[PDB]
Amino acid sequence: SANCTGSFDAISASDFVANINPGWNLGNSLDATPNEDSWNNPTVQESTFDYVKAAGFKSVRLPVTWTHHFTSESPDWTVDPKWLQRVSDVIDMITSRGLYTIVNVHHDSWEWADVTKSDANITQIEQKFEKLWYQIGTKLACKSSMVAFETINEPPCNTAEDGAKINKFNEIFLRAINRAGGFNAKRVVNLVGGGMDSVKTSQWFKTPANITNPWALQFHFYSPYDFIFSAWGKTIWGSDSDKSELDSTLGLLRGNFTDVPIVLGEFDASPTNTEPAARWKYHDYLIRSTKKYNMSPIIWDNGLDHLDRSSGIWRDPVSIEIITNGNETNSLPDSTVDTSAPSQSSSAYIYHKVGTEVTDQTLPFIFNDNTLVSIQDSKGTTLKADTDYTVSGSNITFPASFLSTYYSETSEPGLLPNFTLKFSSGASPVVQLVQWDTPTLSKTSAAASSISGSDLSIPITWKGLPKLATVKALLNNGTYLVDDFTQWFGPFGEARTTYSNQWNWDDKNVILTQATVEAVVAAGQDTVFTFEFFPRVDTTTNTVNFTLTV
Ligand SMILES: *[C@@H]1O[C@H](CO)[C@@H](O[C@@H]2O[C@H](CO)[C@@H](O[C@@H]3O[C@H](CO[C@H]4O[C@H](CO[C@H]5O[C@H](CO)[C@@H](O)[C@H](O)[C@@H]5O)[C@@H](O)[C@H](O[C@H]5O[C@H](CO)[C@@H](O)[C@H](O)[C@@H]5O)[C@@H]4O)[C@@H](O)[C@H](O[C@H]4O[C@H](CO[C@H]5O[C@H](CO)[C@@H](O)[C@H](O)[C@@H]5O)[C@@H](O)[C@H](O)[C@@H]4O[C@H]4O[C@H](CO)[C@@H](O)[C@H](O)[C@@H]4O[C@H]4O[C@H](CO)[C@@H](O)[C@H](O)[C@@H]4O)[C@@H]3O)[C@H](O)[C@H]2NC(C)=O)[C@H](O)[C@H]1NC(C)=O
Ligand SMILES: *[C@@H]1O[C@H](CO)[C@@H](O[C@@H]2O[C@H](CO)[C@@H](O[C@@H]3O[C@H](CO[C@H]4O[C@H](CO)[C@@H](O)[C@H](O)[C@@H]4O)[C@@H](O)[C@H](O[C@H]4O[C@H](CO)[C@@H](O)[C@H](O)[C@@H]4O[C@H]4O[C@H](CO)[C@@H](O)[C@H](O)[C@@H]4O[C@H]4O[C@H](CO)[C@@H](O)[C@H](O)[C@@H]4O)[C@@H]3O)[C@H](O)[C@H]2NC(C)=O)[C@H](O)[C@H]1NC(C)=O
Ligand SMILES: OC[C@H]1O[C@@H](O[C@H]2[C@@H](OC[C@H]3O[C@@H](O[C@H]4[C@H](O)[C@@H](O)[C@H](O)O[C@@H]4CO)[C@H](O)[C@@H](O)[C@@H]3O[C@@H]3O[C@H](CO[C@H]4OC[C@@H](O)[C@H](O)[C@H]4O)[C@@H](O[C@@H]4O[C@H](CO[C@H]5OC[C@@H](O)[C@H](O)[C@H]5O)[C@@H](O)[C@H](O)[C@H]4O)[C@H](O)[C@H]3O)OC[C@@H](O)[C@@H]2O)[C@H](O)[C@@H](O)[C@H]1O
Ligand SMILES: *[C@@H]1O[C@H](CO)[C@@H](O[C@@H]2O[C@H](CO)[C@@H](O[C@@H]3O[C@H](CO)[C@@H](O)[C@H](O)[C@@H]3O)[C@H](O)[C@H]2NC(C)=O)[C@H](O)[C@H]1NC(C)=O
Ligand SMILES: *[C@@H]1O[C@H](CO)[C@@H](O)[C@H](O)[C@H]1NC(C)=O
Ligand SMILES: *[C@@H]1O[C@H](CO)[C@@H](O)[C@H](O)[C@H]1NC(C)=O
Ligand SMILES: *[C@@H]1O[C@H](CO)[C@@H](O)[C@H](O)[C@H]1NC(C)=O
Ligand SMILES: *[C@@H]1O[C@H](CO)[C@@H](O)[C@H](O)[C@H]1NC(C)=O
Ligand SMILES: OC[C@H]1O[C@@H](O)[C@H](O)[C@@H](O)[C@@H]1O
Ligand SMILES: *[C@H]1O[C@H](CO)[C@@H](O)[C@H](O)[C@@H]1O
Ligand SMILES: [Mg+2]
User: Fold this and answer.
1) Of 60, 127, 436, 458, which residue has the fewest beta carbons closer than 10 angstroms?
2) Residue whose CA is closest, atom 8 of ligand 2?
3) Residues 331-350, buried b or exposed e (16+ Cβ, 10 A)?
4) What pairs make up the disulfide bonds (predicted)?
């Protein structure tokens, strides 16, 4: 149908997948609802993609939510021509800077295309979905080979019967875009399995019979759930069994798709909620695994996770170096990975409590055969080797005389300068000086029936790192408020609750969600909430209690 005037440099799906490594998501933008500035990001501007290219990414994934841009319903399901034009212009912002693109159908997946809901009209879902990709395929028919199409984001899928419906999603998609013509018959596509989960995909994905597009599989990876989602008090990552769990997940997917190009379309241990040493060990090992199993990774970034689009600053430059220079071996700060350990340490920090003396701090590092070249603080000062710090094996020691030029027994708590360590190769990790103390809350108790309706914001005086580590929740009689099974999760996991589901924080508050409050009212029992902070030196010192009464 569509007729393109120029030429099209055909590329195989293997080469496309090889050429996009690594990618970066334009998250919470064209996927935001109803408009691209409806969530946390402003209107997309082109300089964003300059920062992305400058950082070493070779591609951008471009999630688009179409739900709120239809100007007619059945049977045409016309998409707003201004929206199609906005998607097309932003793709042109990406490609014109030499970056590959992958554009999809995003939150439509659960907003209207959910086949697991008991009332879903599968006929209407299939018809609207065909019409949608016919229109996107028409608008984007003449894009270069650097533009690929992804079926649909994480489609909900619980059973084999649902898995057959996700396969049909891939088939309806291929038929629509080939019918739209232009260059689409030779365009690289990304096909999807249930939830974009490695296991559901392995179980139920079937290659569309007689497919003729060059095609790659895409999945998403947010495992392990406890670390990545900050659930049940998990604040560490890197044991031998954590590594084997991760390598097993990627290898069993590759094992089911031996000769198929595989895109890892989203992953992120976000700097917002995860501990940095565990975060950098996780990203390092994930990148190592994607190279082992020949997968191209694309990091998720919602605008607040990594790149600050208004300044070009990446909030976590160590992860970006790890993801963008995959042929280099990284020296990393060590950290506690033992879930039975009664104390948690991290070499991404130099911690010092208010009211304690200044002492030498030895930080164990994983050198990985790199040597340390230099250390420079965030004011520009290069540290004097063998005076401001000394190296012994994997240890880096900072003498008390040097550390006391940054803090004292009585200095104010908060974030101090950090140290950037330059090694022979690989990422340059960051050690963060934190002067900490036990935080205080404006309220120590409250009646459940007086704070109700909404989330409970409790104003807090942060003393050190302005981040919450987890929240313990115990009923008065000793029963856990939620999730019994955390009794098997060690001193720092027993009775702990989950980020966003149960607890949250902001600049001025710690937060207990409305569902946490309603869970106390239902239990009918006073519940003690122990807010816990970094360093997790033990289970009690660096914590503060709030009691919800009944
Ligand atoms: C936020 O709020 C929370 C909740 O309110 C606060 O946590 C609470 O902190 C307090 C204070 O620290 C804890 O009290 C201590 O608890 C000890 C018993 O704990 C164990 O049992 C309880 C009770 O279980 C009942 O309920 C459960 C429900 O399921 C049932 O299963 C069970 O059958 C019972 O019915 C459990 O709740 C508790 O579990 C917690 O901890 C475990 C880990 O251990 C976790 O896994 C759980 O999730 C849970 O968190 C646990 O199993 C008890 O030993 C202890 O009594 C001693 O200490 C008192 C205080 O001593 C300090 O202060 C003194 C100054 O006055 C100093 O002298 C002292 O050295 C110390 O600094 C003493 O007053 C008391 O006499 C006891 O002293 C004895 O032991 C000391 C230590 O060994 C010695 O120094 C003493 O000399 C003395 O030893 C002598 O006597 C003993 C006994 O006779 C002999 O054994 C010994 O040989 C010797 O002769 C104290 O009561 C409380 O447990 C805890 N609650 C919870 C739910 O966590 C939290 O602090 C707060 N945080 C903040 C920051 O504000
Ligand atoms: C080691 O230590 C050093 C300390 O020396 C650490 O360096 C600091 O790192 C910070 C985090 O990376 C960084 O903070 C950012 O600064 C930006 C401003 O930078 C420029 O100005 C300052 C002077 O003020 C200069 O110093 C600096 O060099 C630059 O010139 C801000 O742009 C950033 O704010 C955004 O992020 C924070 C969270 O990180 C948000 O709270 C904040 O609201 C901003 O995010 C909004 O805006 C973006 C759009 O850009 C949206 O995508 C996002 O959703 C948010 O949107 C809301 O708000 C907008 C309004 O803007 C609205 O449109 C929208 O609807 C939403 O409501 C950020 O604050 C420090 O500058 C940096 N300091 C220095 C000296 O370098 C370093 O991290 C340490 N390293 C490690 C590894 O620990
Ligand atoms: O990590 C994938 C991997 O997980 C294995 O399962 C292990 C993992 O379980 C996570 C789930 O735990 C449930 O709690 C269970 C617990 O697992 C049991 O141990 C215990 O006995 O019972 C507990 C409860 O009875 C939690 O209830 C679940 O919430 C959790 O799954 C995660 O759910 C969140 C949020 O889900 C919401 O919607 C549905 C509903 O279930 C839930 O209540 C709601 O809050 C998901 O967040 C979404 O994440 C996507 C991105 O993730 C996508 O990308 C890659 C795929 O792997 C994902 O499947 C896919 O969803 C994001 O875009 C959305 O915005 C978020 O809403 C998480 O994705 C879910 O992981 O941890 C502990 C262990 O016990 C389990 O064995 C599983 O077996 C593997 O096959 C593999 O899938
Ligand atoms: C292709 O992918 C499938 C789906 O992931 C892989 O099959 C799965 O293999 C794992 C590990 O071999 C099985 O888990 C094990 O199961 C038993 C009880 O279920 C337990 O003793 C073990 O601790 C472990 O959890 C899993 O059940 C199995 N699933 C299915 C449907 O067979 C398969 O291995 C992959 N194929 C290749 C060639 O990589
Ligand atoms: C389901 O969708 C089809 C196609 O739009 C329509 O003909 C049918 O009436 C719908 N079913 C119901 C119960 O609304
Ligand atoms: C695929 O192509 C063959 C022709 O070689 C055709 O006979 C067959 O029906 C097609 N498969 C399906 C599942 O329609
Ligand atoms: C490294 O530090 C630990 C803890 O201080 C110490 O026990 C160990 O002997 C040190 N190792 C070397 C090689 O200096
Ligand atoms: C504690 O109270 C809860 C809620 O009131 C109840 O379900 C549970 O059985 C009680 N357990 C004990 C040990 O008292
Ligand atoms: O926090 C930024 C945004 O995140 C999204 O995941 C939520 O759905 C939005 O409601 C929220 O504004
Ligand atoms: C954190 O934990 C480790 C041991 O796990 C210590 O070496 C460190 O000093 C801190 O207590
Ligand atoms: Mg998402």
Assistant:
1) 127
2) 315
3) bbbbbbbebeeeebbbbbbb
4) 4-142
- Among the bound ligands, name the one nearest to the CA of residue 479: 8
Same domain, 173 and 57: yes
Same domain, 445 and 467: yes
Alpha carbon 413 to its chain's center:
29
Residues 491, 387 share a domain: no
Residues 64 and 107 in one domain: yes
Residue at 178 is within a domain: yes
Same domain, 370 and 356: yes
| Number of domains present in the structure of the chain | 3
- Interval between CA 44 and ligand 9 midpoint (Å): 16
- 218 with 261: CB under 8 angstroms? no
Question: Cα of 479 to ligand 8 centre, how many Å?
Answer: 6
The ligand whose atoms approach the alpha carbon of 390 most closely is 7
**What technique solved it?**
X-ray
Per-residue HEC secondary structure of 72-110 comes to: CCCCCCCECHHHHHHHHHHHHHHHCCCCEEEECCCCHHH
- Whole-number Cα distances in Å, 428 to 313, 330, 373, 419: 16, 8, 10, 10
Q: Which domain holds residue 427?
A: 349-436
User: How many other CB atoms are there within 10 angstroms of residue 175's CB atom?
Assistant: 15
Q: Is the CB of 430 under 6 A from ligand 2?
A: yes
CA of 364 to the centre of ligand 7 (A): 8
Is residue 63 a contact partner of residue 27, using CB atoms and an 8 Å limit? yes
Query: What's the resolution in A?
Result: 2.0
Domain boundary among 413, 436, 459: 436
Point out the domain boundary residue: 260, 293, 327: 327
Mutate which of 275, 336, 339 to test ligand 10's pocket (most atoms within 8 Å of Cβ)?
336
- Tell me the helices (H) and strands (E) count for the chain, helix number first: 13, 24
Q: Rounded to an integer, what distance in angstroms lies between the CA atom of residue 382 and that of residue 168? A: 59
